[PDB]
Amino acid sequence: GSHMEYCPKMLSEIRQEDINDVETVAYVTVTGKTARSYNLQYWRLYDVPKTAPSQWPSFGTLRDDCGNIQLTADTDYVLGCKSGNQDCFVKLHDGLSQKEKDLLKE
């Protein structure tokens, strides 16, 4: 079926509230798109809201059932997700301010 939980949102600004409400925040590149999911390369899991797990896969996918995002090929994003890559927020990595860098402990 379709799930509101697989409708990622673009964030203009990453704030503490956004970080606290996800399980992981990651630095990713979108490497392509299958049917309904973006393909992802993971570069780093930030140590927020909690210290990052020791082990994490280099590849993953992000499902979008809505289309309220239009991610571009070979483009870098910060991706904040609850477990299973649901209720995600997305922000262009090249658009990070120093404030956001500090929140992410970049």
Side-chain angles (χ1 to χ4, degrees):
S2 301
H3 307 269
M4 68 187 300
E5 300 83 357
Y6 292 133
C7 297
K9 60 180 186 182
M10 295 305 305
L11 283 191
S12 61
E13 182 176 16
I14 300 168
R15 307 148 310 189
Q16 193 62 59
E17 314 96 81
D18 308 306
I19 291 162
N20 288 349
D21 206 45
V22 296
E23 192 52 45
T24 63
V25 186
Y27 174 18
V28 301
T29 305
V30 173
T31 62
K33 181 162 193 181
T34 204
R36 207 192 212 155
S37 298
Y38 295 97
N39 293 138
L40 306 175
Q41 164 80 50
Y42 282 81
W43 300 111
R44 174 178 177 184
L45 302 193
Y46 299 97
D47 296 306
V48 292
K50 312 181 292 305
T51 303
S54 301
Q55 291 175 40
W56 189 266
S58 301
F59 316 107
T61 58
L62 176 66
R63 180 165 154 181
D64 178 17
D65 279 1
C66 283
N68 293 335
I69 64 173
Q70 198 77 72
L71 309 185
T72 48
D74 303 320
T75 302
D76 290 354
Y77 295 95
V78 175
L79 175 66
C81 289
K82 298 181 171 67
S83 298
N85 279 4
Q86 77 187 67
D87 284 329
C88 300
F89 70 74
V90 189
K91 162 98 185 199
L92 197 71
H93 185 261
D94 285 340
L96 289 172
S97 63
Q98 188 55 48
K99 180 178 293 184
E100 295 171 292
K101 293 183 180 175
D102 289 345
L103 285 178
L104 294 172
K105 282 76 188 274
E106 192 210 57

